Amino acid sequence: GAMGSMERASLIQKAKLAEQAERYEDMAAFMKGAVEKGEELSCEERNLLSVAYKNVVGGQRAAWRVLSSIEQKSNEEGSEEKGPEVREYREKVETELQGVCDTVLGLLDSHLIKEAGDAESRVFYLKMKGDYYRYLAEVATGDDKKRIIDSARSAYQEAMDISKKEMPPTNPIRLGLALNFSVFHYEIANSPEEAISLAKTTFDEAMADLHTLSEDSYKDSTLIMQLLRDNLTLWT
Amino acid sequence: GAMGSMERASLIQKAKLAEQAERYEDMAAFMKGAVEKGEELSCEERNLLSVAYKNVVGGQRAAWRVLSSIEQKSNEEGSEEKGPEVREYREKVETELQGVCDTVLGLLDSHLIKEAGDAESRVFYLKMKGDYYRYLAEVATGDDKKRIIDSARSAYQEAMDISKKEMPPTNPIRLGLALNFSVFHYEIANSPEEAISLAKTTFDEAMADLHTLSEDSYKDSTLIMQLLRDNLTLWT
Amino acid sequence: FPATV
Amino acid sequence: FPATV
Ligand SMILES: [Ca+2]
Ligand SMILES: [Ca+2]
Ligand SMILES: [Ca+2]
Ligand SMILES: [Ca+2]
Ligand SMILES: [Ca+2]
Ligand SMILES: [Ca+2]
Ligand SMILES: [Cl-]
Ligand SMILES: [Cl-]
């Protein structure tokens, strides 16, 4: 595509520069270009890909929430009619968000997931698949909402099955997957009890494995464990 | 252009929504569309225009500074050669920034300034002209740098002449113009003494006129006076 | 909103 | 950087 003429290594280098400059749209475009070279991604490169799109979609989600709240208020009793503009602009932002999600899901399907054989890579990409279907579910209101939710669930579940077989309970990818799948249960699937159970079991199994870790690995795992605890505190 | 089919009032409404959602690129595009309808802008509409572009160009300037610093370090003694990528990406961001400045200057020239007869509107637009030429000067390194600096100076000077004749010394537009022209002197024109003199004289003349103001006007003027004081403290 | 990574 | 508005 647009980045077809730039070297893979140059795209990676520029993604890192874009991150330093907080230019996340550029970062995402560079990493899309790097994926489309067709080679597998290293650990570092996978994290550049995820950081870039997380920041782009994160801004879109925040904007969508603002606009949705204004729209909800416009449709309350006693609200004066202001015309189609709030709905139109919310729809514009929504369409852009859906486009970013479709872009990410497209990269995963063509062909990151199918070439990922190691547990660390495969779980990482399946977590991404679940996350981006979750973002589509957040804005879905139509005939496909159930199918979108089931697509998220299925991706998370495959990732969980691999992670439990192949990774220690303190592995950061495994922990972050569980954190996000727990949020899926609470916020998307209307299953708060499942969310709470998953967060608690994950935390406790990680606690019991901390003794095996170096100082630096301990720091990484305990950071994510604290996010599990934070959600449990929010929900209980 | 792109917004040619949308009502003026709808563009204004959506600019306000975009501001609430912190979608400043969208805000700027809506306000560009509103300007291109050909009617003069109200006070409120002028401030939507300035806020939108200030935020867009502000992000570009911050990114440019990050990339320029990396590039400067790459060209120091003992630095390992990393190829053309840092320069290329700095150039990309620079070109985008220059494009935004050219867009704003184009709106001012076609035809906001020529139709602005009231002091408040004319000074507001001439301040913008000076500011956007100043942003072009920040990145200029070639045969036109002197001409760009002189274009900024000329716009600021016309604005200052009108403001001194037609506005009280506490007027926020007059104060903000003086603040920015003082920064032009310090950072662009290599004239720190002129910068300091202008900030001090502006502050002192405003101080002497505060007694004439309502509580709310006093608040507005004193806020900007504090920025003058902050710059003086930085520079002395 | 709850924490995700 | 100095303050501008
Ligand atoms: Ca190559
Ligand atoms: Ca829609
Ligand atoms: Ca493989
Ligand atoms: Ca009309
Ligand atoms: Ca250039
Ligand atoms: Ca006029
Ligand atoms: Cl729209
Ligand atoms: Cl580039």
Commentary on this structure:
- It is classed as peptide binding protein.
- Keywords: 14-3-3, protein-protein interactions, stabilization.
- It forms a tetrameric assembly.
- 14-3-3sigma binding to the ERa peptide and compound 33.
- Chains A, B are 14-3-3 protein sigma.
- The complex is a heterotetramer, with 2 copies of chain A (236 residues) and 2 copies of chain C (5 residues).
- With 236 residues, chain A is mainly alpha-helical.
- Chain A has one domain (8-235): 14-3-3 domain (Delta-Endotoxin, domain 1, Up-down Bundle).
- Helix content of chain A is 78%, strand content 0%.
- In chain A, helix 5 packs antiparallel against helix 6 and helix 5 packs parallel to helix 7.
- The longest helix of chain A has 32 residues, at 43-74.
- Chain A is globular, with a radius of gyration of 19 Å.
- By secondary structure, chain C is mostly loops.
- In chain C, 0% of the residues lie in helices and 0% in strands.
- Chain C has no helices and no strands.
- Chain C is rod-shaped and about 15 Å long.
- Classes of the chains: A mainly alpha (236), C little secondary structure (5).
- Chains in contact: A-B, A-C, B-D.
- Bound molecules: calcium ion (CA) (6 copies) and chloride ion (2 copies).
The computed structural class of chain A is mainly alpha
CATH secondary-structure class of chain A: Mainly Alpha
What oligomeric state is this?
Answer: heterotetramer
User: Roughly what percent helix of chain A?
Assistant: over 70%
What characterizes the major β-sheet of chain A?
A: none
In CATH, the homologous superfamily of chain A goes by the name 14-3-3 domain
Helices and strands of chain A, in order, run as HHHHHHHHH
Return Rg of chain A in Å.
19 Å
Principal-axis shape of chain C: rod-shaped
Instruction: Indicate the proportion of strand residues of chain C.
Output: under 5%
How many individual helices of chain A? 9
Tell me, briefly, the overall form of chain A: globular
The appropriate CATH architecture of chain A is Up-down Bundle
Number of domains of chain A: 1
The radius of gyration over CA of chain C amounts to 5 Å
Largest protein interface, residues of each chain: A-B, 24 and 24 residues
Bound molecules: calcium ion, chloride ion
Report the total helices of chain C.
Answer: 0
Protein name (chains A, B): 14-3-3 protein sigma
Site (Interaction with phosphoserine on interacting protein) (chains A, B): 61, 134
Modified residues (Phosphoserine) (chains A, B): 10, 79
Keywords (chains A, B): Cytoplasm, Nucleus, Phosphoprotein, Secreted, Ubl conjugation
